[PDB]
């Protein structure tokens, strides 16, 4: 089978809910990330044969959100585009599907990534069927399509509490994990470890010069001394999950360029990394929290690798309890997982995070002179996706 | 490269806007189609390794629409699922991506299809940012995300008028094409030519037995003597497109099961058809109407076939002018295109039509003892997808 290489990989900084990017539509954040990925390698945009963008909450973004991102990035109108929705796994599934397009022989160069502006998700009304007498409900699209389990009608955070109970993960352990994610995020930013992968967003102003948004803003929104006293927001009695040890709602995008060996060599491009293998797995919807621990072994077996062969891991931190549970189940050394921080501190724009953690993993491997890395992310409905990459030194 | 076979292919009947399926959510229509595809071949649901469903208008469907369809069809909670959005090409792109997953070596059996309930698409309000003084607008999600070109802010029907003008396709020609689509649809239904592919929808009633919806209802909504007198709804002066010669808004779903050679032979299944090749193409957004004439030659070249090798064609009839324009550009014999009727008469649930026309094409080829067929469908943003299949006798 053809090899698939990652020749560029970038992300926007992540904005807080109703924060610095709340006025920049998801499709424009996608445009910034895609253009950034092309610009890193000075790639002629007409070399791109397809664009796959993860995007969970598409309402009100307008027709063909992935086309809007591609055209906004400067790709020509001859570029096909598709938006993909595997909830929080969307950006990773986009990369996997793009790799399959290369392996199937159909494209030599392809963009894959994800985008989300959670600040701009609308509320919904059934406007076509009148209500002759009675109150009418406007559903928050974030809660209805993003954060509520269909089958239980409960918030993802309630599923996080189920995980905490079953795997004996305490409030104190979740808080310590969260504090570590905040500390690692601030340290990696201070060390320049996000400078390579982050492409800034220019924000037009009503009057004056644009604001250049260049750094994640979520990880500064923390008061460490308040963390052990915050209320448990999903469960009144015997709860464990809080606003601080859960991830937040965020805005951001990410993008990667994938190529065949023949195409990258014809262009004189040295790859960042090779995609070794990938896999999806699923279990009961209420157990989406531990599905990454099912998906990663499948990807490892496809790679003919063992868990001991992986130098660094990126597991998306939808909740601190999710990070702790998958580490515990797989027996992972926490010093090798999310070493530059994770979503509890950095943020979590649903449709982008699955590709964002690949972007970060590439740079973690280079920063540590490592070889194999693995990334995995859970998703609503009970799923997870996982991918194994090889750093090319 | 591995061959990819279609071992089953079904569709729901299509309901009219606010019609017989308006109370059956898109995800449940998807469940009916997927279960129907499994039932045709008595397939153990656990053989399915992934599910890709096209779905253009996901707002308010709840979390993970493709999971809801899969679980509703009786697939186990171990089945990964993804929803794909290439506007009207979504269902075809789902099938193409699924074929790539087989060719890439990653799955041996996969479900691909599409689903849409246009009746249930909500209106949108920005509920998070108050408006201190002034009227507030609720955008129709169908118009905003489905039917309006982003760049021109005009309806797809206005792009249809641009096509009519540039390609000299008159009102009278569009009306004659529409009448032919209605006539062919009624004839094929009367001849039993949709009995094989259509799986009925049972509709629960407030009191009493369910209603069994088993036949397309759009093609009976026509008054032939009124057609030449209807108003031109997108352009007041010198218009050509009407409510009768444009497609309608509709509800419906469709689903196919794809397999490798090794898997179908191990299960003792005879394939319906082989997927020979497929392709995407794009041009300027306002020229989405003629993009099928760009995509099909790419697919033919990948198949090492010429247009003369194709026995029958399915080109989605988003508008009569689109059908006429692509026939004219490619020089196709209208007696070989959409021979059982098309979307102008049968309906057009956006995310399902791209796979629906493959389902219909399979049966057209068998009904006519034919070999090669091609299907193609345009999509907002300037794209089209095309697929070439080989009937297995
Ligand atoms: Ca700094
Ligand atoms: Ca937090
Ligand atoms: Ca260990
Ligand atoms: Ca009949
Ligand atoms: Ca019509
Ligand atoms: Ca001809
Ligand atoms: Cl899933
Ligand atoms: Cl496109």
For residues B385 and B376, the answer to whether their CB atoms sit within 8 Å is: yes
Q: How many CB atoms are located within 10 Å of the residue B143 CB?
A: 13
What are the φ/ψ torsions at residue A31 (nearest 5 degrees)?
A: -60, -45
CA distance B162 to B322: 11
DSSP secondary-structure letter at B242? B
**Lookup: tokens for A377:** 């992310």
- Give me the DSSP letters along B105-143: TS-SEEEEEEEEEGGGPPEEE--SS--SSS----EEHII
Ranges of H-type helices in chain A: 26-40, 65-72, 90-103, 141, 156-166, 171-190, 261-266, 292-303, 320-330, 343-346, 350-367
CA distance A130 to B76: 37
Distance between first and last Cα of chain A: 23
For residues B91 and B356, the answer to whether their CB atoms sit within 8 Å is: yes
Report strand pairing: B250-260 vs B4-11: antiparallel
For residues B79 and B369, the answer to whether their CB atoms sit within 8 Å is: no
**Best mutation site among B25, B96, B104, B157 for testing chain A: the one with the most A CBs within 10 Å?**
B104
Backbone breaks in chain B (C–N > 2.5 Å) follow which residues?
none
CA of B16 to the centre of ligand 4 (A): 18
For residues B14 and B347, the answer to whether their CB atoms sit within 8 Å is: yes
For residues B37 and B9, the answer to whether their CB atoms sit within 8 Å is: yes
What are the φ/ψ torsions at residue A378 (nearest 5 degrees)?
A: -85, 165
DSSP secondary-structure letter at A88? B
For residues B388 and B310, the answer to whether their CB atoms sit within 8 Å is: yes
What are the φ/ψ torsions at residue A125 (nearest 5 degrees)?
A: -130, 140
For residues B271 and B9, the answer to whether their CB atoms sit within 8 Å is: no
Q: How many CB atoms are located within 10 Å of the residue A239 CB?
A: 16
* CA-based torsion, A51, A339, A346, A208: positive or negative: negative
**In the beta sheet, which residues pair with residue B384?**
B281, B378
For residue B154, count CB atoms less than 10 angstroms from its CB and return exposed for 0-12, middle for 13-18, buried for 19 or more. middle
CA dist A116 → A12, A140, A243, A354 (Å): 11, 16, 20, 11
Q: What is the distance of C-alpha B388 from the center of its chain?
A: 16
Q: Closest CB to B285: pick one of A77, A80, A144.
A: A77
For residues A282 and A305, the answer to whether their CB atoms sit within 8 Å is: no
State which residue of chain B sits closest to A378, comparing Cα positions.
B80
Residues 6+ apart with CB under 8 A from B338: B181, B184, B313, B314, B315, B317, B323
A203: three-class secondary structure by DSSP: strand
**Lookup: tokens for A345:** 């501190």
For residues A57 and A141, the answer to whether their CB atoms sit within 8 Å is: yes
CA dist A35 → A48, A197, A258, B274, B281 (Å): 12, 13, 14, 38, 21
Does domain B1-123+193-275 sit in CATH 2.30.60.10? Answer: no
- Contact at CB, A105 and B138, closer than 8 angstroms: no
Of all ligands present, the nearest one to the C-alpha of A377 is 7
**Lookup: tokens for B279:** 């392709």
For residues B12 and B29, the answer to whether their CB atoms sit within 8 Å is: yes
**Lookup: tokens for A370:** 């490592």
For residue B285, count CB atoms less than 10 angstroms from its CB and return exposed for 0-12, middle for 13-18, buried for 19 or more. buried
For residues B53 and B117, the answer to whether their CB atoms sit within 8 Å is: no
State which residue of chain B sits closest to A384, comparing Cα positions.
B80
B309: three-class secondary structure by DSSP: helix
Total residues found in chain B within this entry: 393
For residues B156 and B380, the answer to whether their CB atoms sit within 8 Å is: yes
B378 carries an active-site annotation: yes
CA distance A48 to B89: 19
Q: Closest CB to B64: pick one of A64, A87, A138.
A: A87
For residues A390 and A274, the answer to whether their CB atoms sit within 8 Å is: yes
Q: Treating both helix axes as pointing N-terminal to C-terminal, what angle do B26-40 and B65-72 enclose, rounded to 10 degrees? A: 40
Q: How were these coordinates obtained?
A: X-ray
- Contact at CB, A67 and B381, closer than 8 angstroms: yes
Total residues found in chain A within this entry: 393
Ranges of H-type helices in chain B: 26-40, 65-72, 90-103, 141, 156-166, 171-190, 261-266, 292-303, 320-330, 343-346, 350-367
- Structural Rg of chain A based on CA atoms: 20
For residues B247 and B347, the answer to whether their CB atoms sit within 8 Å is: yes
* CA-based torsion, B349, B351, B353, B358: positive or negative: negative
- Contact at CB, B122 and A125, closer than 8 angstroms: yes
CA distance B188 to B219: 11
B347: region left, alpha or beta (phi > 0 left; psi from -120 to 50 alpha) = left
Q: How many CA atoms lie within 13 A of A98 on its CB side?
A: 37
Domain ranges of chain B: 1-123+193-275, 151-192+276-389
CA distance B17 to B349: 9
* CA-based torsion, B294, B296, B301, B305: positive or negative: negative
CA of B189 to the centre of ligand 4 (A): 6
For residues B62 and B68, the answer to whether their CB atoms sit within 8 Å is: yes
Reported resolution, Å:
1.6
User: Nearest Cα to B279, choosing from B268, B293, B267, B263?
Assistant: B293
User: Nearest Cα to A155, choosing from A349, A380, A350?
Assistant: A380
CA dist B277 → A342, B91, B193 (Å): 42, 16, 26
Q: Closest CB to A122: pick one of B62, B127, B285.
A: B127
B358: three-class secondary structure by DSSP: helix
- Give me the DSSP letters along B32-97: HHHHHHHHHTT--GGG---EEEE-S--TTS-S-HHHHHHHHTT--TT--EEEEEBTBTHHHHHHHH
Binding region of A: 246, 331
Ranges of H-type helices in A194-346: 261-266, 292-303, 320-330, 343-346
CATH number of B151-192+276-389: 3.40.47.10
Of B155, B159, B163, B378, which residue is the catalytic one? B378
Residues 6+ apart with CB under 8 A from A286: A149, A151, A152, A159, A162, A382
Determine if residue B381 is labeled as part of a ligand binding site: no
For residues A232 and A240, the answer to whether their CB atoms sit within 8 Å is: yes
User: Nearest Cα to A8, choosing from A199, A280, A250?
Assistant: A199
CA of A38 to the centre of ligand 8 (A): 19
Helix (H) or strand (E) holding A7: strand A4-11
- What's the gap in Å between the CA of A111 and the closest CA on chain B? 15
Q: What is the distance of C-alpha A241 from the center of its chain?
A: 21
Residues 6+ apart with CB under 8 A from A94: A52, A53, A54, A84, A112, A113, A114, A354, A355
Helix (H) or strand (E) holding A201: strand A201-203
Residues 6+ apart with CB under 8 A from A236: none
| Chain A residues whose beta carbon lies within 8 Å of the beta carbon of residue B127 | 122-123, 138, 140
Q: Do domains A1-123+193-275 and A151-192+276-389 have the same CATH topology?
A: yes
Residues 6+ apart with CB under 8 A from A199: A10, A11, A12, A32, A33, A35, A36, A39
Of all ligands present, the nearest one to the C-alpha of B189 is 4
CA angle B220, B223, B224 (to 5 degrees): 110
B159 carries an active-site annotation: no
* CA-based torsion, A94, A100, A103, A107: positive or negative: negative
For residues B82 and A93, the answer to whether their CB atoms sit within 8 Å is: yes
A120: three-class secondary structure by DSSP: helix
- Contact at CB, A81 and B381, closer than 8 angstroms: yes
B88 carries an active-site annotation: yes
- Give me the DSSP letters along A135-158: ----EEHIIIIIIB-TTT--BHHH
- What's the gap in Å between the CA of A377 and the closest CA on chain B? 13
**Lookup: tokens for B134:** 């002034």
Residue with tokens 């996997």: A96
For residues B264 and B7, the answer to whether their CB atoms sit within 8 Å is: yes
- What's the gap in Å between the CA of A180 and the closest CA on chain B? 30
- Contact at CB, A104 and B106, closer than 8 angstroms: no
CA distance B265 to B104: 19
CA distance A128 to A142: 22
């Amino acid at each position: 089978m053809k090899e698939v290489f990652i020749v560029s990989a970038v992300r926007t900084p992540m904005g807080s809910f109703m924060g610095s990017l709340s006025g920049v539509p998801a499709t424009q954040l996608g445009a910034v990330a895609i253009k950034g990925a092309l610009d890193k390698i000075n790639l002629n945009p007409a070399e791109i044969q397809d664009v796959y963008m993860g995007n969970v909450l598409q309402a009100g973004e307008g027709q063909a959100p992935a086309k809007q991102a591609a055209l906004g990035a400067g790709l020509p109108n001859t570029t096909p585009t598709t938006a993909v929705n595997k909830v929080c796994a969307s950006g990773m599934k986009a990369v996997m599907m793009a790799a399959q397009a290369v392996k199937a022989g159909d494209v030599e160069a392809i963009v894959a990534g994800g985008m989300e502006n959670m600040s701009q998700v609308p509320h919904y009304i059934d406007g076509r069927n009148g209500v002759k007498l009675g109150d009418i409900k406007l559903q928050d699209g974030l809660l209805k399509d993003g954060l509520t389990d269909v089958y239980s009608k409960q918030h993802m955070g309630n599923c996080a509490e189920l995980c905490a109970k079953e795997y004996n993960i305490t409030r104190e352990e979740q808080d310590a994990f969260a504090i570590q994610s905040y500390e690692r995020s601030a340290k990696a930013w201070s060390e320049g470890k996000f400078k390579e992968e982050v492409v800034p967003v220019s924000i037009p102003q009503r009057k004056g010069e644009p604001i250049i948004f260049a750094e994640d803003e979520e990880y500064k929104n923390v008061k460490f001394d308040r963390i052990p006293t915050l209320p448990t927001v999903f469960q009144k009695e015997n709860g464990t999950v809080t606003a601080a040890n859960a991830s937040t709602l965020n805005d951001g995008a990410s993008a990667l360029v994938l190529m065949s060996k023949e195409k990258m060599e014809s262009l004189g491009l040295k790859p960042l990394a090779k995609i070794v293998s990938y896999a999806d797995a699923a279990q009961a919807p209420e157990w989406f929290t531990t599905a990454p621990a099912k998906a990663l072994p499948i990807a490892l077996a496809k790679a003919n690798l063992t868990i001991n062969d992986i130098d660094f891991f990126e597991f998306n931190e939808a909740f601190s309890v999710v990070g702790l549970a998958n580490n515990k189940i797989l027996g992972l050394d926490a010093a090798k997982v999310n070493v530059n921080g994770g979503a509890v501190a950095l943020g979590h724009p649903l449709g982008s995070s699955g590709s964002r953690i690949i972007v970060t993993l590439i740079n973690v491997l280079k920063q540590n002179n490592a070889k194999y890395g693995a990334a995995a992310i859970c998703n609503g409905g009970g799923g997870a996706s996982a991918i194994v990459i090889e750093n090319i030194k």
